[PDB]
């Protein structure tokens, strides 16, 4: 728990929930400071949600240095991911990726998700914007503690989230990866997506997506949650593909 051993350098956030800043802890460690707008969250919402994030530990899950809540206002202190959101990285880096690199990114996220799944945590918003790239190229899952383009059917039809809905979400995240940051169903209204999806239509195979990686992406989009593989299973399937 941090008092103010923090140094705010510049920001990067938006929307009531707080701002995010680039900062330093102890004039040393580069960190990402997420503050929360006053009255933008019940104090017990922040308290219990924060202690949940600190109870999670995995190499493909962004880490926390501590929290600030002595009342001035309130902020969560994360390690700094040098390359921002996977969404943004894929976009500006587009055309410079090798299929192998993109597949490695998916494996990174699947690993983090496999951990969250096993720890019975649902991520309800798994997308490229919520993934972070480090000054390694390593991908870590974030924001782990409507967007119908990432929602599975049982979620369209009023919010039945689970670890299997995250898988569907992962399938779309995989599409965003191999398409190098493209927008899924860009020229389609929510209605159209739900209609096209309810007819068995799925996002096309990006060119960088091999016929084998696109089979996997379609298992994630199986209409029935029980038919979708669990992250623990996707990990080994993606792993075997990466091997050729
Ligand atoms: N995605 S960004 O803000 O352009 C950015 C740029 C450069 C570096 C970072 N690295 C970093 N490292 C650890 C983090 C750990 C938690 C959060 S929450 C958040 C956010 C929330 C709501 C709107 C916009 C941003 C960014 C980060 C975060 N971000 C992020």
From Swiss-Prot:
It is found in: Cytoplasm; Nucleus. Residues 6-241 form the Protein kinase domain. Ubiquitinated. The active site is at 125 (proton acceptor). ATP binds at residues 12-20, 34. It comes from the Eukaryota. Induction: Through a myriad of surface receptors including the TCR/CD3 signaling complex, coreceptors, or chemokine receptors. T-cell lines and natural killer cell lines. The modification Phosphoserine is found at residue 191. It is linked to Lymphoproliferative syndrome 1: A rare immunodeficiency characterized by extreme susceptibility to infection with Epstein-Barr virus (EBV). Inadequate immune response to EBV can have a fatal outcome. Clinical features include splenomegaly, lymphadenopathy, anemia, thrombocytopenia, pancytopenia, recurrent infections. There is an increased risk for lymphoma. The N-terminal PH domain allows ITK to be recruited to the plasma membrane by an activated PI3 kinase. This domain also contains a proline-rich region (PRR). The adjoining domain is a SH3 domain, which binds to PRR (from itself or from other proteins). Next, a SH2 domain is required for binding tyrosine-phosphorylated substrates. In the C-terminal region, the kinase domain is required for tyrosine phosphorylation. Homooligomerizes; this association negatively regulates kinase activity. Interacts with PPIA/CYPA; this interaction regulates TCR signal strength via a proline-directed conformational switch in ITK. Interacts with THEMIS. Interacts with FASLG. Interacts with VAV1; this interaction is important for VAV1 localization and TCR-induced actin polarization. Interacts with TBX21. Tyrosine kinase that plays an essential role in regulation of the adaptive immune response. Regulates the development, function and differentiation of conventional T-cells and nonconventional NKT-cells. When antigen presenting cells (APC) activate T-cell receptor (TCR), a series of phosphorylation lead to the recruitment of ITK to the cell membrane, in the vicinity of the stimulated TCR receptor, where it is phosphorylated by LCK. Phosphorylation leads to ITK autophosphorylation and full activation. Belongs to the protein kinase superfamily. Tyr protein kinase family. TEC subfamily. This is Tyrosine-protein kinase ITK/TSK. The gene is ITK. The chain holds residues 358 to 618 of 620 of the full protein.
């Amino acid at each position: 728990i941090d008092p103010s051993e923090l140094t705010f350098v510049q920001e990067i956030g938006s929307g009531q929930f707080g701002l995010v800043h680039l900062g330093y802890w102890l004039n040393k460690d580069k960190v990402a400071i997420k503050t929360i707008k006053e009255g933008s969250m019940s104090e017990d919402d922040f308290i219990e949600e924060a202690e949940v994030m600190m109870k999670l530990s995995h190499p493909k899950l962004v880490q926390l240095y501590g929290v600030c809540l002595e009342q001035a206002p309130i902020c969560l202190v994360f390690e700094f991911m040098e390359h921002g959101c996977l969404s943004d990285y894929l976009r500006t880096q587009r055309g410079l990726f090798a299929a192998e690199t993109l597949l490695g990114m998916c494996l990174d996220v699947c690993e983090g998700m496999a951990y969250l799944e096993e720890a019975c945590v649902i991520h309800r918003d798994l997308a490229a914007r919520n993934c972070l790239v480090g000054e390694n190229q390593v991908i870590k899952v974030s924001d782990f503690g409507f967007p119908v383009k990432w929602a599975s059917p049982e979620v369209f039809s009023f919010s039945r989230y689970s670890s299997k809905s995250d898988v569907w979400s992962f399938g779309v995240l995989m599409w965003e990866v191999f398409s190098e940051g493209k927008i899924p169903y860009e020229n389609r209204s929510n209605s159209e997506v739900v209609e096209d999806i309810s007819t068995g239509f799925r996002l096309y195979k990006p060119r960088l997506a091999s016929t084998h990686v696109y089979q996997i992406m379609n298992h994630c989009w199986k209409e029935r949650p029980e038919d979708r593989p669990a992250f623990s299973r996707l990990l080994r399937q993606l792993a075997e593909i990466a091997e050729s």
